[PDB]
Symmetry: C3
Subunit: 222 residues, 3 copies
């Protein structure tokens, strides 16, 4: 449309759809329950992102938030996406290393707080307070990153793939608060179309690229 | 009230309440954890539907969606219902056959996508796009139906009851996209009061009738 | 601010933050998976409440509901809080006594209905109907309380601590429908600032005081 960010929403929709179908079909012929768990998780993530990208593309997942005086376009739908897909991603990680249930609950819960406070910050109409929600969310994120590094005798195939995904995770997820901060969501240094670009590249890498790495490894098979 | 569909919301409220109390009391005197699981799931479903029917009845779960120019009455509350009650129903099925966790996650996730895209379609103000959400939702549904048929040495009592519920499920759930499509939610061929009627008959059959069948079987006992 | 209830939202924010950090740090040095489960659950609860208190404090989690003619301030954010934190609290209880999965689902589900109907009642614009939602919610509550008392050979350390928390639970949770009923949410007998006070004292006691009791016991260690 007339939304210059449309092309990135379009590309994101397509690439999340294609990764969904790739992983869906790829997961055809899997019988191992454990592999089945990662296929389910890992196919669902871009499946959900596909729907939320499409909802952004079609304009459904977009709202206007008054702040700085202005009517600030906020694609709220990506938080609906992340609300489900980031814990699923963490679940992929958590299951890989067979985390304790307490640790998984800590991660999912901290994740829900990260996304929920990010959404609150995204929709907050007092500009200064946006960054307060950003900060708390970032602290939840740093908590999660902490746990992924200092809280986790697995088979070497698990380890190796975990350590790759874990590095992928930390590098990509850490970029999101920066994009939010510098983008139209936060301080407005970088335009919406570029923030949308950045998040789409991160999301495809964090969802499809992550899943390609994961669904490639024998780590997912018992 | 003046809502001609009220009587069906009224009847649905009553019948979901009565089925809730029937299953609640019926489940009094159950000690087997497994039976306890199906009683919990199966009582919760019409309990939730009771609340959402009442919310529709009282007008709370109703909104107006602009499309075709018009202010289209949309009872959004039934999606809040379904969001919780359809995965629970699938969980009843999944537990019956002791599904793999991956398969359950696939079902619940596909279900959330079915309902969430149905809700997005229901609230979408671009009329043509409504049916795009319908189509994706329908594809999630067909995925679920696929899985219920081609993805599931259980005791013959499990099998038999599973196969009955599974047929009940497929026939009733398949009717909902058709009702949505032809009803005021979709193409508007059939009035809101008749769509509300149709969904109430399906919902009572899919919740109370389903639960009667299930809570009747010894399949639910270990 | 000019919201006389601000001080209580401020105090609640602070005390939930401080309890979050206390339990977070306190939980440093825990390795027992079971203890890890209660630390996770129990730290998350005031962590979530911290965010929702702050959201109330900052004015984000506040809406106006027309009823009696008036624009009635409703802090909806505490229902978002409770939606997650009350099942977690019940989960703390449920895990303590190793409840059956069916019973946990019954509790969480009844809880979701309690909070969801309380939120519906809170946002309902027909004043009389508010108390209908109150009544149903109260019945869900009484169901939960029923289950906590008549539905649960645990080690004596479990029992004892369970029985204390269970009494804490019943006494504190029972006060909330009364506060809602007499407060600005319900019949308006007691002002918003006092209802906010009352709920803050209950919430801190039910979250931090509860968690102090729990995270003090050896009941949480296998
Ligand atoms: C747990 C574990 C962790 C707890 C999380 C801690 C922080 C919780 C914050 C919550 C807040 C939720 C945001 C939303 C409810 C508030 C909407 O109010 C907006 C701002 O006034 C309204 O503007 C416009 C409204 C905008 C629309 C918002 C859409 C969002 C919805 C995403 C959820 C979906 C659920 C499935 C639906 C099918
Ligand atoms: C240690 C604490 C617990 C951590 C919590 C951090 C709270 C975040 C700070 C929020 C607040 C102090 C910033 C307010 C913006 C201020 C610098 C600009 C002047 O205010 C203007 C209106 O008066 C903003 O309009 C528009 C001007 C804008 C273009 C200015 C952009 C603001 C940016 C704020 C970025 C904060 C992060 C970089 C924090 C870094 C860590
Ligand atoms: C340690 C952390 C707590 C941060 C301390 C804060 C100091 C209190 O804020 C005052 C300074 O204006 C008054 O705010 C009054 C205006 C507003 C009230 C302030 C509420 C929030 C600014 C304070 C809540 C803590 C922040 C959270 C930062 C994220 C943290 C987890 C890293
Ligand atoms: C996306 C940007 C535009 C491009 C940035 C490219 C940076 C390249 C990433 C390199 C990192 C990966 C490290 C190599 C790997 C091997 C490490 O494995 C170690 C062995 O267990 C793990 O220990 C400990 C593991 C350590 C790895 C933790 C990663 C840290 C995060 C480093 C970057 C941060 C994200 C950048 C934020 C910026 C975009 C605002
Ligand atoms: C997972 C697994 C799968 C992921 C699902 C993929 C698709 C996700 C779609 C989501 C969208 C949610 C709909 C809602 C948040 C959007 C509301 O915006 C409306 C349309 O502009 C506003 O009009 C009027 C608003 C209307 C009100 C909508 C009510 C709905 C709320 C139902 C959820 C409840 C949660 C528990 C509450 C207690
Ligand atoms: C193969 C694809 C991937 C599948 C995706 C399917 C997308 C759904 C089609 C949507 C769109 C083409 C239909 C638009 C309605 C069009 C026929 C009527 C003319 O447009 C009018 C406004 O210009 C509609 O107003 C009002 C007129 C209405 C009364 C017309 C009702 C429309 C109906 C559409 C029903 C579509 C389903 C039957 C698809 C069957 C499978
Ligand atoms: C609700 C409507 C108004 C009334 C429609 C009445 C149709 C009667 C339903 C019959 C069906 C049940 C089949 C008999 C049963 C026995 C089958 O068991 C088989 C043995 O394992 C299962 O194999 C494979 C199982 C096969 C069963 C799958 C069912 C398919 C769905 C068939 C109908 C579709 C729904 C109708 C959509 C319409 C309302 C738009
Ligand atoms: C399960 C198990 C049990 C099922 C529960 C049975 C009862 C379900 C009731 C549900 C209703 C949800 C309330 C909300 C969706 C309805 C919003 O409509 C309001 C009233 O017209 C709009 O005013 C203003 C809107 C106000 C904002 C409401 C905020 C609420 C959101 C809290 C959820 C959050 C989810 C995570 C977000 C991140
Ligand atoms: C056995 C049933 C299944 C249980 C369901 C209970 C339904 C709750 C009753 C709702 C309704 C009868 C009460 C309506 C308020 C009425 C007493 C006051 C007169 O109506 C006024 C407008 O006409 C209310 O405006 C404003 C006046 C207000 C200040 C009056 C406050 C109303 C209060 C209602 C409190 C009800 C609980 C105490 C129930 C106790 C158990
Ligand atoms: C037993 C329980 C059911 C309560 C019976 C009700 C009686 C029907 O309400 C009529 C009296 O005005 C008509 O309401 C018409 C106006 C409105 C319609 C009434 C709907 C609700 C008032 C009735 C639903 C039951 C209530 C729930 C009370 C909580 C219960 C679980 C304890
Ligand atoms: C918060 C208010 C302002 C202050 C109210 C102070 C009341 C004092 C609470 C005492 C209670 C605790 C009972 C002692 C304990 C020991 C009981 O253990 C028994 C041994 O298994 C359990 O059997 C069965 C256990 C029995 C305990 C169930 C508790 C019941 C609830 C009693 C009060 C109710 C809540 C008050 C509502 C009011 C605030 C509207
Ligand atoms: C087996 C594979 C590679 C899967 C292909 C199926 C569908 C597409 C997904 C694969 C694409 C990219 C891999 C993930 C990493 C990323 C950095 C993607 C960034 C996307 C940018 C838009 C267009 C660029 C492309 C060259 C993919
Ligand atoms: C043991 C039983 C049958 C349960 C009775 C408790 C409460 C009511 C539920 C039972 C009713 C119906 C069975 C489910 C199937 C359906 C097709 C119901 C359609 C409902 C239509 C409205 C009025 C019709 C009735 C004759 C029930
Ligand atoms: C080890 C302990 C006690 C924890 C301290 C960390 C942070 C604060 C939480 C402890 C405070 C209170 C215990 C819970 C019980 C309550 C009745 C609290 C009611 C709060 C009222 C506001 C100010 C009062 C205080 C004296 C705490
Ligand atoms: C699938 C998409 C992924 C993996 C998205 C990850 C997003 C995050 C790690 C976002 C974190 C944010 C913060 C730490 C603070 C500001 C708000 C967020 C939500 C952008
Ligand atoms: C308890 C009620 C039940 C079992 C409801 C089931 C509803 C569905 C199977 C609905 C499916 C739909 C589609 C496939 C597309 C259009 C939207 C829906 C949500 C009506
Ligand atoms: C953390 C906060 C806690 C433990 C809150 C508990 C709240 C309840 C037990 C609330 C119950 C209510 C009813 C029974 C009816 C009216 C509405 C509620 C939600 C206040």
């Amino acid at each position: 449309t007339g939304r210059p960010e449309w092309i990135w929403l379009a590309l994101g929709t397509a690439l999340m759809g294609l990764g969904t179908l790739y992983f869906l079909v790829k997961g055809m012929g899997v019988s191992d329950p454990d592999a089945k768990k990662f296929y389910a998780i890992t196919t669902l993530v871009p499946a959900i992102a596909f729907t939320m990208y499409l909802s952004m593309l079609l304009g459904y997942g977009l709202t206007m938030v008054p702040f700085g005086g202005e009517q600030n376009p906020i694609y709220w739908a990506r938080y609906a996406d992340w609300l489900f897909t980031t814990p699923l991603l963490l679940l992929d990680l958590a299951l890989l290393v067979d985390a304790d249930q307490g640790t998984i609950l800590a991660l999912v819960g901290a994740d829900g707080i990260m996304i929920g406070t990010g959404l609150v910050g995204a929709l907050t109409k007092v500009y200064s307070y946006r960054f307060v929600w950003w900060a708390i969310s970032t602290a939840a994120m740093l908590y999660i990153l902490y746990v992924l590094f200092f809280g986790f005798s697995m088979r070497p195939e698990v380890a190796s793939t975990f350590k790759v995904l874990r590095n992928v995770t930390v590098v990509l997820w850490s970029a999101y608060p920066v994009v939010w901060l510098i983008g139209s969501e936060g301080a407005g240094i970088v335009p919406l179309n570029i923030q949308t670009l950045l998040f789409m590249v991160l999301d495809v890498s964090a969802k499809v690229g992550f899943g390609l790495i994961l669904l490639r490894s024998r780590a997912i098979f018992g």
